[PDB]
């Protein structure tokens, strides 16, 4: 089956370079053209350029002419995009897309997920996880404050509580991210049984479990 797989999220200091990769598999590499698209979080899509393996033909969106370099390995069926002299407005989610070489009656039929590049001088910071207990249907939650790199992972009881959960998008309080999550469960369920929100901030490799306890 056709699958395009891209490198994981990145965090680089301004000025340095980054090499984003798009790995193809399940189809002949030298028959389709790989496009690259940038989507600044929130805003709309923007094209950067295409690359055709085989001929090695490139054609940059002429805005990103000095920003981006398109190369390819071909032995691993992998297209590369390097961005150099990074600044704050390069922080965006970057897609790769596939299109047939000689068609016209085709479209960008397969995409390869996002890669969220973050350009900042902020230091990588683990999160502080605080439980939130109240004081017929009982709402709980935990607060995840004071982390930077992004993203984080919040489950409840290792994923045993799925429905009735609301994990909210992060925001920058100063120059650190803050996130909140909630779970609502029957009064018969809690505090008579354990409730433990599970947080994971992979950029610092932390993995935290906080039991929600009623107050005194």
């Amino acid at each position: 089956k056709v699958q395009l797989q891209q490198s994981g999220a990145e965090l680089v200091k301004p000025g340095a370079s980054v090499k984003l990769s798009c790995k193809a598999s399940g189809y002949t590499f030298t028959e389709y053209i790989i496009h690259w698209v940038k989507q600044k979080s929130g805003q709309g899509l923007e094209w950067i350029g295409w690359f055709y393996p085989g001929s090695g033909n490139i054609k940059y969106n002429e805005k990103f002419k000095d920003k981006a370099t398109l190369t390819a390995d071909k032995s691993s069926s992998t297209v590369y995009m390097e961005l150099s002299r990074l600044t704050s407005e390069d922080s965006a989610v970057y897609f790769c897309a596939r299109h047939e070489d000689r068609n016209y009656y085709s479209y960008w039929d397969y995409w390869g997920q996002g890669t969220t590049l973050t350009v900042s001088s902020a230091k990588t910071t683990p999160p502080s996880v605080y439980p939130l207990a109240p004081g017929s249907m009982v709402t709980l939650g935990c607060l995840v404050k004071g982390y930077f790199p992004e993203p984080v992972t919040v489950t409840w009881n290792s994923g045993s509580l799925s429905s009735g959960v609301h994990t909210f998008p992060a925001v920058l309080q100063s120059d650190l991210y803050t996130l909140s999550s909630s779970v609502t469960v029957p009064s018969s369920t809690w505090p008579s049984e354990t409730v433990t929100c599970n947080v994971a901030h992979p950029a610092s490799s932390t993995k935290v479990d906080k039991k929600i306890v009623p107050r005194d």
Binding site: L45, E62, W111, T178, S182
Partner: protein
Amino acid sequence: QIVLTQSPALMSASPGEKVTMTCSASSSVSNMYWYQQKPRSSPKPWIYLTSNLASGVPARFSGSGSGTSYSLTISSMEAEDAATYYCQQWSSNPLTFGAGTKLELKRADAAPTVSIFPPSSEQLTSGGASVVCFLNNFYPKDINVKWKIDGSERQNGVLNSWTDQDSKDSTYSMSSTLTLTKDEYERHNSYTCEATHKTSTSPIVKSFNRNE
């Protein structure tokens, strides 16, 4: 290079209703291509070659245009149709997109379930105090949060966040945070979360006291 201008980005439609999005172009174009994108997910191809309908798409969708004004039409709206739809051009260089129109499910207006939370004993021990206030499951999206401590409006230090529309019941939810110093919090007594929504003729209040 052509600039692609889309119709109302915030569009609301209930199931059954017929929807129409339009993509306007600065210069004439041969064909138009539409894409769909879900909450932080890879955009998939929806309609290509102006009106061909890509692979995966129900026939309730339809493309049209053939000029400088193109359009995407849903004959019968369904719940799995809430998303943001982009229009792409292939004719000139460079390749450009529209800004996107975010389609939304219009349903019966629901009022929020409000919950307020005092700071944890952990946060105080590290010298910090955050009063969280959850507003879960409501429609429509528009809502204002008003904080009150000792019966007066705390203007700054507020922090809002919204989840997107629920795939099940199509409602929204909102987390409001209020971060104080451990010392400033251990001074006032009543902490009120006053929420204003279009459903109710009065704000929904949830408050608590430190002396508990």
